Structure formats: C-alpha cells, structure tokens
Write a protein that binds this ligand. Structure first.
Ligand SMILES: CCCN1CC(Oc2ccc([C@@H]3c4ccc(O)cc4CC4(CC4)N3C(=O)c3ccccc3)cc2)C1
Ligand SMILES: CCCN1CC(Oc2ccc([C@@H]3c4ccc(O)cc4CC4(CC4)N3C(=O)c3ccccc3)cc2)C1
Lengths: 218, 233
C-alpha cells in the first residue's frame, strides 16, 4: 500500500552496511560470508518479502545471493574505473585477478562502466537489487511475488518521471536497466561455475533459515 | 528510421521456418537416438537463424566480427526461446519439431537433462500465463540477439555499442506500441514490458545451464558462424 515515494524511502533505509576485509581468495570468501547476514536483514525489509513463507524466502535467497553480492560490488566500484572495491580496504585491479578469474573480473568491470555511463542513481540501484531478490528464484506465493515486482516497476517509472524524463525516455531507461539484470544473471552463472571449479560453495538452506531468525510461535 | 509498425513487420517477415525431424514410419522413436536427432535439428535451425539475424534491423550495420560475437553469445538462448514459443500451446510438452514432441519422462535418459527440461516447461507456462503474443515474441528474440553479447566485446567498438543501444531502444518503443495498441493502460504497459524483459534473465540462466549440459556430453565455431555470416555477393 506504500506510495512510490514510501517504497524508495523504505529501500534506501534498508541498505546494508559496507563491510571491511579482515590469501586473496580467503579474504574474498570471508567477506562474502559476512555480507550474507546483512543481505538477509536487507531482504526482510524489502516490502512484501516477509509475506512469503519462510521456505519461499529461503529459496529466493538461495537463487539471488550471488547476483546481489555482484550488483553491490559493481555499485560500490562505479566511481573506481578499472578497479573493483570489494571493501574500502580491498580495492583490486584486473592484474590482481590474473584461472578463470579475470574473465569474471572483466564482466564486473564492464557492468560498473555501464552503470557509470547510464548515471545510475542510488534510488534506481535499490529497486534493481530488490527485483533480483524477487525474480531470480520465481521460475498464491507467485501471485504475490508478481505484485511486488509490479510495484517496483511502478516505483522505477516514478523515479524517472520525477527526474524529468519523457514517457519515451522512461520506458527506454526501464528496459536498459532490466537488460543489465540479464547480464548480472549471466555473471552469477559464470561466477558459480568459477567457484565450483575451485572448491562449501553455496549457503545451505539451514544457514539461510537461521539467519532469517524465524519467529518463535510456529 | 523505421516506425514501430515497420519494425514489427520486418521482424515477422524475418521469422525462420519451423523445421522437422526425420520421418520414417518403420523406425519407432528411441531414447538412444534422441540426442542425435536434437543435434541434427539444432544444426539445421542454426543456418536459418543466421538468415534471420541478418534481417533484424540494424544488425548488418555492425562489423562482421561483432555480428559473430553477438551470435556466439545468443545462439542457444535463441534456440531455447524458439522452442518455448513452439511449445506454448502444448502444456507439459516441448515441441522440438512437430514430429518431435517430448515430455519430461523422455528427458530422464540423460543425466542433467530433466532439470533443463523443467526450466523450459516453466518458461512455456509463463508465456501462456502472460498470453505472450507473436509480435512480442519476435521483439524479445531480437533483443536477445542484440543484448546477450554486448557486455563481452576502441572508437569503433564504442560506435557499435551506441548503435546497438539505439536499436534496442527502438525495440523497446515497438513493444510499448504493441501494448498500447492492445488497449493496455500506461501502467500496464510498463508493468508488462518489465515482466517480458525479466523473462530474458531466466532465458539467459537456462542457456548457461544448457551450455554446461552440452559440454557434459559442442558449439558453433567462430569460423563457422563467420562463414555463414561472412557471405559473398
Ligand atoms: C558458503 C557460501 C559463500 N561462500 C562461498 C563463497 O562464495 C563467494 C562469493 C563471492 C566471492 C567474491 C566476492 C566477495 C564479496 C563481494 O561483495 C562480491 C564478490 C564478487 C565475487 C564474484 C563473486 N567474488 C570473487 O571472489 C570473484 C571471482 C572472480 C572475479 C571477481 C570476483 C568469493 C566467494 C563465499
Ligand atoms: C556444431 C554444434 C551443434 N551443436 C549441436 C547444437 O547444440 C545443441 C543445441 C540444442 C540442442 C537441443 C535443442 C535442439 C533444437 C531446439 O530448437 C532447441 C533445443 C533445446 C536444447 C536445450 C538446448 N536441446 C536439448 O537437447 C536439451 C537438453 C536438455 C533439456 C532440453 C533440451 C541439442 C544440441 C549445436
């Protein structure tokens, strides 16, 4: 029932903290592992997410977590051309990423470049992250997921109309942003292949369920 | 310069034919021959896919090298979305060809096959739930061709990317025009545009899972794609 403005405010307020790094792959794995609980706290504040069953919340997180870590990384790195800001004390260039790592590193750098070129705004970024969370695992509960996604679409169009875009420019920018989500899914698929080529790769159902911190009256 | 109506007409006229598998009423269907039949069909469809791509407005303005890169990135997503479209009116079945209509129990002979079979069936069910129209389908296939390779490609590269983005914006305008013509309100137009484009993320996912499956058992070479795209006059 939130207005578009209330939805943006809710998502901006829900943003996770930026964590610091504590051998490169052990540092990156540990950082991702610590980002996960913050991602779950964020997910619980995306309007509509907690109306799903806990089972469905876990299945959406299992499908979206890697895309969500990647989009956050690309967002943090936008203002750092040619580098990836994993953490404020962990800025890497592609030379440090040099088997199979540099290909994904370049895919992420290219996303960051695209966001910088489109002048992606924070209010649009938090809508896109929310769409990843609700859409990556979708293919009563589905009806609700689709209603949330429709509300996020409305909210994106609202932000672009507020910025003064014509209707044509609004639908063109909406499409440009949603096409970037297909590239984020592609990078997550390649990134999973890369992680399975090296290695406990995905968070277990029970780990995610524990972090969701279920209510005590079942 | 094309109007949205001219874009739709060009894309509908470019559609490839629906190809068949071998007929022989003395050879009952066998699970052991299934992969060979599917490989033979995909290879024949690829030739028509190159003819189709050359007819997608703006595609042949790119360099050959970039045309090949786009097709290398998109060919399996394009085969998969065509299969989903051909299957849309056949719940529970994948219509590889009119004489090769399979259910998921036939997908169980090969390790890893049924998971991809189920993702394709789910996409077909989504197309039915959205009542996807043929004019929208041809737009989505063209977006896949232009978009899937654009993030993995100099001043010439910058000019190509700009052109690709301009053609993709034209296809967006064309999808919105079709939705407006169908009577949808402005809110429903944006919502449906977003629903359709989010399905492209699922198609990408299925292509990546599909590629891993084909290598478990490969793909068109740059020279072959270059050879079919690199035509003489
Ligand atoms: C048990 C479940 C979790 N564990 C399994 C482990 O999964 C991981 C997930 C992420 C990463 C890091 C990382 C960290 C933090 C971040 O915010 C973003 C990323 C981006 C990213 C691509 C994914 N990555 C790479 O290392 C990388 C590889 C190639 C090129 C560029 C990056 C490492 C391991 C953690
Ligand atoms: C020189 C290289 C030639 N290579 C052979 C070609 O690779 C192939 C491409 C496609 C397919 C077929 C196929 C055929 C026609 C079609 O229109 C769609 C599909 C869908 C598809 C998923 C991809 N598939 C499966 O078999 C399948 C697997 C799991 C679940 C369901 C389907 C087989 C081989 C290129």
């Amino acid at each position: 029932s939130l207005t578009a403005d209330q939805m943006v405010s809710a998502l901006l307020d829900a943003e996770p903290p930026i964590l610091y790094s504590e051998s490169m792959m052990g540092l990156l794995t540990n950082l991702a592992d610590r980002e996960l609980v913050h991602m779950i706290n964020w997910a619980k504040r995306v309007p509509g997410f907690v109306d799903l069953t806990l089972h469905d919340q876990v299945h959406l997180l299992e499908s979206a977590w890697l895309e969500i870590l990647m989009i956050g990384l690309v967002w943090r790195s936008m203002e750092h051309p040619g580098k990836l800001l994993f953490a404020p004390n962990l800025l890497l260039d592609r030379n440090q990423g040099k088997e199979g790592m540099v290909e994904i590193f370049d895919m992420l750098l290219a996303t960051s470049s695209r966001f910088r070129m489109m002048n992606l705004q924070g209010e649009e970024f938090v809508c896109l992250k929310s769409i990843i969370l609700l859409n990556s695992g979708v293919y009563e509960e589905k009806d609700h997921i689709h209603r949330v996604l429709d509300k996020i679409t409305d909210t994106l169009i609202h932000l672009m109309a507020k910025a003064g875009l014509t209707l044509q420019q609004q639908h063109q920018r909406l499409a440009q942003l949603l096409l970037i989500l297909s590239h984020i899914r592609h990078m997550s698929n390649k990134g999973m292949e890369h992680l399975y080529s090296m290695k406990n790769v995905v968070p277990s159902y029970d780990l995610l369920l524990e972090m969701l911190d279920a209510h005590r009256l079942h």
